[PDB]
Amino acid sequence: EMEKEFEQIDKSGSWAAIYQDIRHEASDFPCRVAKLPKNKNRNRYRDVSPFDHSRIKLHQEDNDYINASLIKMEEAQRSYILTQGPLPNTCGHFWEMVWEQKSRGVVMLNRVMEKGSLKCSQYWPQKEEKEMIFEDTNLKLTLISEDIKSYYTVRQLELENLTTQETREILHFHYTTWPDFGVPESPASFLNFLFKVRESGSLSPEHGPVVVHCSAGIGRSGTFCLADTCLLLMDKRKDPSSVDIKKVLLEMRKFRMGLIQTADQLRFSYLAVIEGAKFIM
Ligand SMILES: [Mg+2]
């Protein structure tokens, strides 16, 4: 039903109409904590906030706030943390969350600079011998290795809790070719990227939830988890054509607002799922 509904929406040119109905139907829950004045500099955008009921709380709790949401997909048996690109003042918070939530992978879907503006702070070290220390959260981060491919980069990082001297290996998956405007021409490299993340074990239930971000953490980030969850459901169910991507998206939007930012991102999500299903038989 998905591939035929796709072609009929293309034929009738009603992607904006379909997308607006999702916007209208989407849940609205309070974001009281995000809106407190003391957290203004912990939010990149005024209009992108985590719901109180699903927000990630920092454990070092004098201020527990971070702009990050837990998206828990019950039937698919997969969880994701969606967050904004770290700000100059929230890089220590970002790695604290990674530590406290026991995540193994970080998925980054933007470049640090896009359209000539800073979209995210440089929150990981660029050279092995120049490690980063986050003094506010008492964490040390070391670049262990880096593998640059044409459409993405994988980095091995070592995160040390300086308080307890425990260390963990974090895998950083950086998709580096999403265009400044619009969506990719073809989903092929995005899907290959998704399967690289999968193959690493970072999405497996023995670990904490993968941390996924772009600049706002709703657009490309929404595309990534939406495609992943829909493909899992097609694999699991007796009837793969029963998977309704609009229903899955609305379910995810119960946990973080704004996921999928444009009708073009919606269309691209359909395209990724349809093409990805062909790969997984
Ligand atoms: Mg060197």
Q: How far apart are the first and last CA of the chain?
A: 16
Distance 171 CA to ligand 1 centre (A): 19
Which residue in 144, 48, 126, 128 sits closest to 87, CA to CA?
Answer: 48
Rounded Cα–Cα distance for residues 197 and 212 (Å) = 11
36: which residues sit within 8 A by CB, 6+ positions away?
65
**Structure tokens of 40?**
């203004």
Q: Concatenated DSSP letters for 31-68?
A: -HHHHSGGGGGG-S-TT----TTTEEEPSSTTS-EEEE
* Inter-residue contact 52 to 30 (CB < 8 Å): yes
Distance 129 CA to ligand 1 centre (A): 7
Please indicate if the annotation marks 150 as binding a ligand: no
User: In whole angstroms, what separates CA 53 from the centre of its chain?
Assistant: 18
Q: How was this structure determined?
A: X-ray
* Inter-residue contact 270 to 60 (CB < 8 Å): no
* Inter-residue contact 187 to 145 (CB < 8 Å): no
Name the helix (H) or strand (E) containing 195: helix 188-199
Rounded Cα–Cα distance for residues 151 and 237 (Å) = 32
Distance 142 CA to ligand 1 centre (A): 12
What backbone torsions phi and psi does residue 154 show, to the nearest 5 degrees? -110, 130
Characterize the bridge pairing of strands 65-73 and 167-175: unpaired
Please indicate if the annotation marks 218 as binding a ligand: yes
* Inter-residue contact 160 to 139 (CB < 8 Å): yes
CB atoms within 10 A of CB 236: 12
Please indicate if the annotation marks 215 as binding a ligand: yes
113: which residues sit within 8 A by CB, 6+ positions away?
119
Active site residues: 214
Q: Concatenated DSSP letters for 192-250?
A: HHHHHHHHTTTTSTTSPPEEEESSSSSSHHHHHHHHHHHHHHHHHSS-GGG--HHHHHH
Q: In Å, what resolution does this model reach?
A: 2.0
Please indicate if the annotation marks 216 as binding a ligand: yes
Say how many residues make up the chain.
281
**Structure tokens of 56?**
């990630």
The domains found in the chain, sorted by start residue, are 1-281 (3.90.190.10)
Distance 125 CA to ligand 1 centre (A): 11
CB atoms within 10 A of CB 203: 21
Token look-up 């092995």 returns: 128
Distance 249 CA to ligand 1 centre (A): 43
Query: What is the residue type of 271?
Result: L
Rounded Cα–Cα distance for residues 220 and 107 (Å) = 11
User: In whole angstroms, what separates CA 242 from the centre of its chain?
Assistant: 25
Please indicate if the annotation marks 220 as binding a ligand: yes
* Inter-residue contact 42 to 89 (CB < 8 Å): yes
**Structure tokens of 14?**
């009603």
Q: Is 238 helix (H, G, I), strand (E, B) or coil?
A: coil
